[PDB]
Amino acid sequence: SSSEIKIVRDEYGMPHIYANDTWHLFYGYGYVVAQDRLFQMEMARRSTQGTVAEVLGKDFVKFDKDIRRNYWPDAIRAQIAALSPEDMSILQGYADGMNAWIDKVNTNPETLLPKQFNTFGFTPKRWEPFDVAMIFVGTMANRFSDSTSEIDNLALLTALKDKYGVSQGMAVFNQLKWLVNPSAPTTIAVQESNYPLKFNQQNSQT
Amino acid sequence: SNMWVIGKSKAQDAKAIMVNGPQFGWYAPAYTYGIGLHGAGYDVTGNTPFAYPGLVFGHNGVISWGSTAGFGDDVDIFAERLSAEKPGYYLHNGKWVKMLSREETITVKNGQAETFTVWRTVHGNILQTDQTTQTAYAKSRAWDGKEVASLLAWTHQMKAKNWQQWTQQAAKQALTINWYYADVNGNIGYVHTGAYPDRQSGHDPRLPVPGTGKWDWKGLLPFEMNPKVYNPQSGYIANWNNSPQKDYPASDLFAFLWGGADRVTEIDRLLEQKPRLTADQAWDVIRQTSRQDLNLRLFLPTLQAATSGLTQSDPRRQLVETLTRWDGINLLNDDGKTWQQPGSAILNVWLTSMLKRTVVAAVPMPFDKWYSASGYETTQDGPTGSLNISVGAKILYEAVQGDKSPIPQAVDLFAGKPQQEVVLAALEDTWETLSKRYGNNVSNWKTPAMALTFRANNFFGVPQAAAEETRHQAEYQNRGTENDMIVFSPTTSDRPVLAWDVVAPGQSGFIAPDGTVDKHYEDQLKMYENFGRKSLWLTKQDVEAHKESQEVLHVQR
Ligand SMILES: O=C(O)Cc1cc(O)ccc1O
Numbered sequence: 123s124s125s126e127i128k129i130v131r132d133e134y135g136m137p138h139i140y141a142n143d144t145w146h147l148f149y150g151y152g153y154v155v156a157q158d159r160l161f162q163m164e165m166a167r168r169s170t171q172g173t174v175a176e177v178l179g180k181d182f183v184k185f186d187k188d189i190r191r192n193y194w195p196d197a198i199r200a201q202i203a204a205l206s207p208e209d210m211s212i213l214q215g216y217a218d219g220m221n222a223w224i225d226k227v228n229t230n231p232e233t234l235l236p237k238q239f240n241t242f243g244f245t246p247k248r249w250e251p252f253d254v255a256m257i258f259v260g261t262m263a264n265r266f267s268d269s270t271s272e273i274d275n276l277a278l279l280t281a282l283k284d285k286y287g288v289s290q291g292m293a294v295f296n297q298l299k300w301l302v303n304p305s306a307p308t309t310i311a312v313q314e315s316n317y318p319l320k321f322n323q324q325n326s327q328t
Numbered sequence: 329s330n331m332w333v334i335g336k337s338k339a340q341d342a343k344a345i346m347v348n349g350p351q352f353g354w355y356a357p358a359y360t361y362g363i364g365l366h367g368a369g370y371d372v373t374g375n376t377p378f379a380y381p382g383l384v385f386g387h388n389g390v391i392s393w394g395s396t397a398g399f400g401d402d403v404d405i406f407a408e409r410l411s412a413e414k415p416g417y418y419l420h421n422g423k424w425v426k427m428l429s430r431e432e433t434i435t436v437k438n439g440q441a442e443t444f445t446v447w448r449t450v451h452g453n454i455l456q457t458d459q460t461t462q463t464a465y466a467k468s469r470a471w472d473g474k475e476v477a478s479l480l481a482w483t484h485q486m487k488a489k490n491w492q493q494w495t496q497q498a499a500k501q502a503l504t505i506n507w508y509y510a511d512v513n514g515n516i517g518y519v520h521t522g523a524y525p526d527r528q529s530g531h532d533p534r535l536p537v538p539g540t541g542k543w544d545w546k547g548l549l550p551f552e553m554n555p556k557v558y559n560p561q562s563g564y565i566a567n568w569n570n571s572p573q574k575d576y577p578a579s580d581l582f583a584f585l586w587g588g589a590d591r592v593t594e595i596d597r598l599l600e601q602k603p604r605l606t607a608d609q610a611w612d613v614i615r616q617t618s619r620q621d622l623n624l625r626l627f628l629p630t631l632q633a634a635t636s637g638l639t640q641s642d643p644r645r646q647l648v649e650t651l652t653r654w655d656g657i658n659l660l661n662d663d664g665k666t667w668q669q670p671g672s673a674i675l676n677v678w679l680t681s682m683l684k685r686t687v688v689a690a691v692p693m694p695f696d697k698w699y700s701a702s703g704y705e706t707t708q709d710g711p712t713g714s715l716n717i718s719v720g721a722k723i724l725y726e727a728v729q730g731d732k733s734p735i736p737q738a739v740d741l742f743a744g745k746p747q748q749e750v751v752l753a754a755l756e757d758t759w760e761t762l763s764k765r766y767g768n769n770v771s772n773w774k775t776p777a778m779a780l781t782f783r784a785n786n787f788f789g790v791p792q793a794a795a796e797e798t799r800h801q802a803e804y805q806n807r808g809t810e811n812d813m814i815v816f817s818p819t820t821s822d823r824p825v826l827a828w829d830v831v832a833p834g835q836s837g838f839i840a841p842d843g844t845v846d847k848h849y850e851d852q853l854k855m856y857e858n859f860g861r862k863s864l865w866l867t868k869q870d871v872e873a874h875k876e877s878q879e880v881l882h883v884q885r
């Protein structure tokens with residue numbers, strides 16, 4: 123059967139999803155996620171979009187503004203609109219499977235609503251593809267692939283130039299924050315290859 | 329986060345073994361989510377952060393994969409030229425271009441709503457603006473526009489059956505992430521994935537560039553430039569967020585460096601120690617590196633040379649002999665709260681004093697505070713992530729190497745004094761501080777161990793569980809938030825693969841409205857603490873044989 127999704131959980135509660143097409147497979151996955159981790163997923167959804175202060179209040183207003191200033195939601199929706207039907211199924215199947223369990227939860231809350239929703243006073247809402255994509259963007263691109271301190275580096279450099287003079291201030295900057303260090307231990311041995319690019323280390327752009 | 333991958337030539341009783349400890353901090357409920365997917369071309373088993381569609385850690389019965397953070401420099405800052413008249417515009421390639429802008433309203437439970445505007449240029453969102461210079465800074469990411477494709481590359485790679493198919497998907501992941509491969513025939517590989525800018529000549533990537541046009545990136549570098557290796561002559565791949573390859577530049581963060589002092593050397597020593605390892609030995613590197621002081625190996629030679637002409641009753645010398653007898657492995661006493669040897673407390677106080685006399689002194693306030701941490705700083709709940717060697721300590725390591733360091737010492741960090749004199753004064757500072765608290769008998773010093781907290785708040789500082797759901801573990805372990813091991817063609821079984829993992833506190837976070845906790849809410853927590861692990865199943869017959877329950881749905885799109 124093309125309409126059948128079978129979910130088998132092992133002795134540690136780990137779900138295995140058996141299904142015949144993409145949309146059914148990811149619908150199963152979303153459905154067990156909503157079963158196991160609904161409050162965690164809902165606070166991750168508000169964390170990655172900057173909507174924490176609506177349920178948690180005034181201490182989270184700066185947080186929410188910082189999250190929103192660091193991304194451009196229309197550029198994410200445009201990437202979602204360019205997917206092929208097979209790829210879009212992954213995301214849409216996942217959000218639909220979550221929605222299926224959230225519907226059962228909001229229909230029978232006396233036994234199925236996670237305790238923390240009563241504790242913090244609010245109830246789950248339905249997901250769309252955009253929300254699934256934003257879990258990954260906010261917790262993998264946005265936190266962990268977005269590191270820079272270029273503006274603080276420049277204020278360090280400027281204060282080293284005042285202390286030691288223009289050329290000397292630069293050379294101390296290179297002692298503290300070198301561009302490369304040829305003695306660093308590397309995952310690839312030097313007998314296999316080395317990186318081929320060389321970079322300016324004088325701040326030649328000023 | 330660390331990883332070691334052992335190939336054919338180094339493996340004993342198997343052709344390939346892959347061990348991965350991604351380090352994201354420690355949370356309740358668990359950071360990652362266990363899931364097996366069987367259908368539509370997929371046949372996989374593993375676990376993945378925030379239940380993403382694509383599994384960051386697992387295998388498909390033919391190959392296996394894992395990750396560690398890359399820290400390449402893929403973000404630069406563009407100094408945009410504003411105008412006091414004609415605001416909302418910026419100069420770019422000879423014309424005044426208008427900014428993108430959007431309005432946001434922050435609703436607030438039990439408060440008033442707040443609205444603000446976000447601005448964006450061709451280079452990216454505006455971080456901050458200097459109205460005095462009429463400059464606005466825009467953060468430009470090399471992966472901008474490729475977020476969704478990176479997520480999908482992490483999902484499609486689960487179907488690859490060889491290196492060639494797997495690298496096709498690695499070429500589409502655009503974030504700075506190391507990716508690792510192993511397979512059933514014993515091949516192993518590594519790719520430092522991601523999109524990196526093709527910068528103009530003269531662009532120093534550690535500092536801002538003018539946003540007026542001439543400094544704009546030319547494009548992105550091809551995938552052939554990404555550091556990568558397949559079936560290395562060594563027989564193994566090891567990483568702990570260290571450099572990929574000789575001459576590859578790191579992130580521009582001032583606190584991040586790839587230097588001669590690096591914690592991955594601790595893994596290398598263990599893999600080079602034995603000609604071949606078994607799975608049980610590859611798993612046992614988690615236990616050693618978890619408990620290893622990272623500064624000992626670096627500064628013990630320096631301490632030994634400086635106290636070599638001292639008498640036996642000089643207490644600075646007795647501190648260095650205690651360190652000389654130690655292997656650096658921390659172990660708890662029977663009280664569950666103090667370490668068995670005082671070595672990490674001695675290095676901690678020594679290094680703090682050494683940095684304050686050397687690196688800190690050459691740097692103008694208030695930047696001196698960036699280089700004073702010893703790397704042992706924690707609180708009562710313990711470290712929030714991995715232990716590493718601090719920046720100040722990597723810079724001090726280059727200085728104590730002398731002309732053996734490739735880094736030109738533009739300022740003498742010892743300020744004219746012989747090294748030994750500065751080491752001996754810091755050693756006197758250490759003796760003074762510790763003997764005061766513990767007394768003079770070094771052998772009965774019982775110094776505080778670091779503990780480990782599974783936090784109720786997620787990494788952003790937002791609650792994902794109630795405060796009482798916090799879990800405490802007596803021993804701090806410098807290891808993955810989860811650990812997983814994959815073993816290909818075991819000579820000890822008929823199965824072509826064997827795999828294990830541990831996802832603590834447990835698979836479920838569910839608590840019913842009456843307070844009843846799910847059965848799988850904390851059944852992996854003690855297993856984590858004792859270095860145990862559970863089997864991952866892949867085949868239908870193994871899933872059937874270990875089934876605890878079944879639910880069938882009938883649904884039509
Ligand atoms: O190590 C980190 O600090 C972050 C990180 C870990 C990992 O295993 C994969 C990606 C990633 O970003």
Ligand SMILES: [Ca+2]
Nearest residue numbers: 403404533580
């Ligand atoms: Ca940069």
